[PDB]
Design a protein around this ligand. Structure first.
Ligand SMILES: O=c1ccn([C@H]2C[C@H](O)[C@@H](COP(=O)(O)OP(=O)(O)OP(=O)(O)O)O2)c(=O)[nH]1
Ligand SMILES: O=c1ccn([C@H]2C[C@H](O)[C@@H](COP(=O)(O)OP(=O)(O)OP(=O)(O)O)O2)c(=O)[nH]1
Ligand SMILES: O=c1ccn([C@H]2C[C@H](O)[C@@H](COP(=O)(O)OP(=O)(O)OP(=O)(O)O)O2)c(=O)[nH]1
Lengths: 130, 129, 138
């Protein structure tokens, strides 16, 4: 499958899959931001994508940063719908009780996966079969 | 074209729906009013039960707007709905804001439900990699 | 459906092999290899005593256990944890106590997470100057 991607911010590298078989491509921060303990920010990644119909984009936290500094994503896994053509934004939060997180423009702050989704049709029933 | 059987345990709420074609999830409603003080959690009823087909999994995800705007999260995200489960879907909401309480009223949309295939892998112990 | 195998190594042989508790359950439970106490707001990187070989074309996903999320506010900082197809190391779980007041005590042999395996689309990114110009312009 291909994923069309617009670099809204041309100063950042194109997201790339570091190893073959890696699930995600890393997303970059377009901005310098400091998160005090317990505080959050909505951070621009400088990209937009066109997730194919029948698929979903998923924004996951990076594991390294998660343990080392307690960086997380409030709405994790972030859900990118097929019809979304805006900028991908990452709702970062510092879950460390005492130390700030310094995020720089150019840092890898999340990863983007693409998977198939079942666009189920909901059928209301009165009860389930037992 | 897969169908997802659903029961409104709470008949007074709208049926969950896909806002646009292609959207991965359907929004779940709260059946209840809840106030979450900063850092507190609550297990909130949605008024629905579903029948995830065998070979698939139900996934409860946070909504992006409330996440940023008020710091609303889900403790066990992504909430895993197994194919054998036929009880009420409940959402473990938590307030990750430091100072501002979160108000949820009955009828608010508090989460989204995705359905995916899952690989029901058979584990095989090996000596080494 | 009929799936494949997942090769698994018990780096810690005193723990039980993860298993699927019921036939169509999405996940298998992972165990803690360690005793650890998490004070309110504190996290730890907890060893599970296992390594896996997620098939190429797939991803392993580490999800929190719902039960403990509710009873005690246990969560996973990088949820869902992403286990890449090429990883052969030990699976570790970034546990965090989201309760404001009660410590969480984790014992060796306790179930601390679940592991799912799914297909993933190993997309090839194609840069386009704009969606409008690409014919892709909710
Ligand atoms: O909950 C997890 C998540 C990941 N991992 C392992 C598997 C994976 O392939 C690797 C890296 O994960 P990720 O890409 O999320 O973190 P990173 O900070 O980007 O580290 P790396 O440079 O190793 O990718 O670490 C775990 O043991 N447990
Ligand atoms: O981490 C994320 C998650 C979402 N989005 C964008 C993509 C997506 O299609 C849209 C809506 O996300 P979601 O459906 O989670 O939020 P909502 O509060 O339910 O908004 P909506 O009313 O637009 O569905 O916002 C992001 O940029 N980053
Ligand atoms: O956000 C969620 C997550 C799970 N469940 C339901 C679905 C699922 O199949 C069941 C899990 O029950 P169980 O008591 O087996 O949980 P556990 O064994 O403590 O952990 P897990 O749910 O992670 O298997 O509860 C929900 O209603 N909402």
């Amino acid at each position: 499958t291909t994923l069309a991607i617009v670099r809204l911010d041309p100063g950042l590298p194109l997201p790339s899959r570091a190893h073959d078989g890696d699930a995600g491509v890393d997303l970059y921060s377009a901005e310098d931001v400091e998160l005090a303990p317990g505080r959050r920010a909505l951070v621009r990644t400088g990209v937009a994508v066109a997730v194919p119909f029948g698929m979903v984009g998923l924004v996951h936290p990076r594991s390294g940063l998660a343990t080392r500094v307690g960086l997380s994503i409030v709405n994790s896994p972030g859900t990118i719908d097929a019809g979304y053509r805006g900028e991908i934004k990452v709702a970062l939060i510092n879950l460390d009780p005492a130390a700030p997180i310094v995020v720089h423009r150019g840092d890898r702050i999340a990863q983007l996966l693409v998977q198939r989704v079942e666009l189920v049709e909901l059928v209301e029933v009165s009860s389930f079969d037992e």
